Amino acid sequence: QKIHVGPGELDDYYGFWSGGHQGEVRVLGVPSMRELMRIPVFNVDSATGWGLTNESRHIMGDSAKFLNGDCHHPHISMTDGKYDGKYLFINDKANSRVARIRLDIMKCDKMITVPNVQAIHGLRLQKVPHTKYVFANAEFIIPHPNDGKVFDLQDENSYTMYNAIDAETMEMAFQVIVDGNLDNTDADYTGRFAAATCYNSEKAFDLGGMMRNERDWVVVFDIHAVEAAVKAGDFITLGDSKTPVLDGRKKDGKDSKFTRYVPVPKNPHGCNTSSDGKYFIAAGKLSPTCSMIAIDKLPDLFAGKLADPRDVIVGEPELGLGPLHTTFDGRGNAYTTLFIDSQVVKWNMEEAVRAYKGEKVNYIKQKLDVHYQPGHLHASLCETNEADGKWLVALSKFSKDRFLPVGPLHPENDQLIDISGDEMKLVHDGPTFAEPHDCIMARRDQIKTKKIWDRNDPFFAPTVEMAKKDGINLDTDNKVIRDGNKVRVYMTSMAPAFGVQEFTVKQGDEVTVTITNIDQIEDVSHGFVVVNHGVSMEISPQQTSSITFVADKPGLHWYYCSWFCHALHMEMVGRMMVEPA
């Protein structure tokens, strides 16, 4: 199988890599593992102006004031348990957000700060009949209200919440209060259930405290019941947020309609749905096991036809030290990372289930050593009923001597493994910055991208409406509008010339520059940088982009095109003249 992609050949799959603590999404080609694009999300990108432009800051909202993020879990929207290539969603653990990327344009187009929570970590998407909800965990227990009067984690009103976000509007759909906490989450192949791991059933703040119980749990959600109750008006609201909040905690040993708690050892981490839709599989972490929940049995467990939530457990195979995550080949095998043993282990799921019933059968097929300390792993199409069993990527946290030395900070090592046959074979070591946690792969044919921008694109639609209010036709016009101490420059750009090559303002004026790139050849991107003003943005063919800054320095100040666009690139410049105060 494959591995090398020569000059002029194309990769077979797209890979969407989390940027981890660096805050972007990275687009790679697979199997070459080459990075094709960076999509700024929670990071400020000097190149495109993400975090500086008026269009980006509108999307970010009030959260545009943060210069950091911490992303882990990239996921592609689904239709009937297959990728539809519409959206990618990702979490921000640092500043508690979820963002949506439009895959047609490879840009973040929506962002939300989840209300009344701390630390968005686990994230996954409804699969069936389609991604109606984005599911996301808030990891940390906090007081409600968090007003500084109570700090105790055991308080009646100290808890965390499971979050559902409407995938299309990117507005909150509902929140569910839970016992313990939340780590990772996955969804079924019907749309009725979702599940999450919990490592802090103790509601402790100290290490020993958090490891006290032999068992924490997987919490299972009946979204049907949730939706039913929201429809009926049977919910509370918290603070000034209008989001429906349901109580999924236990009361005096009795369940809520919304949740069931399945005991699982021990500070479990991964929560993974098998490609056949049979199981939620929780990785044991401190327990050298995985726990297999039979989704089949969940209706009976919510109907109470079951005397014990442990009865939904149909497998608990011992695999090795520190199991963290599980993926699938669609051939009946599961692949689990063993952080401590530094291996990926291949195991047979139906054999594991028979072994749980006492049968003497070896469900373990192979252990591949990886380099070093694997976290997540991802098999091609593993989140869909189309799991194709071809490629596997294991994402390891300590690269040691696997790459040239680069100082005290090392890359992560994302290792590509061919799983197409009977024996797993390590084929590529991929260094990556700032710790991608997870990644997702999609077939080439699953992603359709725009070659050039549409003038009606929603990404800059508000800017078009601003322009129309000034009587500006963006496709043709070069004009300076004055409004008190505001100056709005509108210009077309066509290599190698800006449409407005000079303009004069007064010291202290707030200047908005709006640029529409009217080159129609694909790939002729323009840039716009104002020297010594901290101003920088990209304008691609048929895009409009705007940026606003104060002209607080008198004199001549040059601006230039940053994207090499024409033989006369260097000469694509202009002059802002600032009259003394």
Stretch 381-400 residues interacting with K ion (CB under 5 A): 397
572 binds ligand CUA (CB under 6 A): yes
Q: How far is Cα 346 from Cα 333, in angstroms, rounded to an integer?
A: 7
Q: Which is nearer to Ca ion, 182 or 349 (CB)?
A: 182
We find the least distance from the C-beta atom of residue 504 to a second copy, in angstroms, to be: 8
Residues 131-160 that bind a second copy (CB under 8 A): 139-140, 142-143, 145-149, 151
> Which residues have a Cβ under 8 Å from the Cβ of 215 and sit 6 or more positions away?
201, 263, 264, 265, 266
Q: Is 490 annotated as a binding residue?
A: no
List the interface residues with ligand CUA, window 499-558 (CB under 6 A): 526
Is the bond leading into 145 cis (omega within 30 degrees of zero)?
Answer: yes
Q: Count of residues binding ligand CUA (CB under 6 A)?
A: 10
Query: Site mask, Cl ion, residues 249-288, x = CB under 5 A?
Result: ---------------------xx-----------------
Amino acid (1-letter code) at residue 530: V
139 is an interface residue for Ca ion by CB under 5 A: no
- Could you tell me which of 383, 394, 377 has the C-alpha nearest to residue 442? 383
User: How many Cβ atoms sit within 10 Å of the Cβ of residue 370?
Assistant: 22
- What residues from 175 to 214 belong to the interface with Ca ion (CB under 5 A)? 213
Query: Coil, helix or strand for 396?
Result: strand
> By CB under 8 A, is residue 452 in contact with a second copy?
yes
Cα within 13 Å of Cα(460), Cβ side? 25
Nearest distance from C-beta of residue 66 to Cl ion, angstroms: 25
**Pattern of binders to Ca ion over 263-282, x per CB under 5 A?**
----x---------------
Strands lying side by side in the sheet with 502-506: 502-506, 573-579, 555-560, 526-530, 535-539
Kindly state the smallest distance separating residue 397's Cβ from K ion, in Å: 5
CA distance 466 to 173: 30
DSSP strand pairing (172-178 vs 245-247): parallel
Nearer to Cl ion among residue 74 and residue 270 (C-beta): 270
437 is in an annotated binding site: yes
H or E element at residue 309: none
DSSP code for 254: B
Q: Which does 397 bind (CB under 5 to 8 A by kind): Ca ion, Cl ion, K ion, none?
A: K ion
Residue entry with tokens 């080949």: 329
Q: Which partner from the list ligand CUA, Cl ion, a second copy, none does 526 bind, CB cut-off 5 to 8 Å by kind?
A: ligand CUA
Which positions from 169 through 228 interact with a second copy, judged by CB under 8 A? 183, 199, 205-207, 210-211
Task: Indicate whether 491 belongs to the interface with ligand CUA (CB under 6 A).
Answer: no
Residue from the set 17, 53, 55, 69 that interacts with a second copy by CB under 8 A: 69
Token output for 477: 């016009």
Does the annotation place 106 within a ligand binding site?
Answer: no
Cα–Cα distance, 63 to 276 (Å, whole number) = 39
Which residues does the annotation place in the binding site?
Answer: 72-73, 121, 199, 202, 210, 216, 267, 269, 325, 376, 397, 412, 437, 526, 561, 563, 565, 569, 572
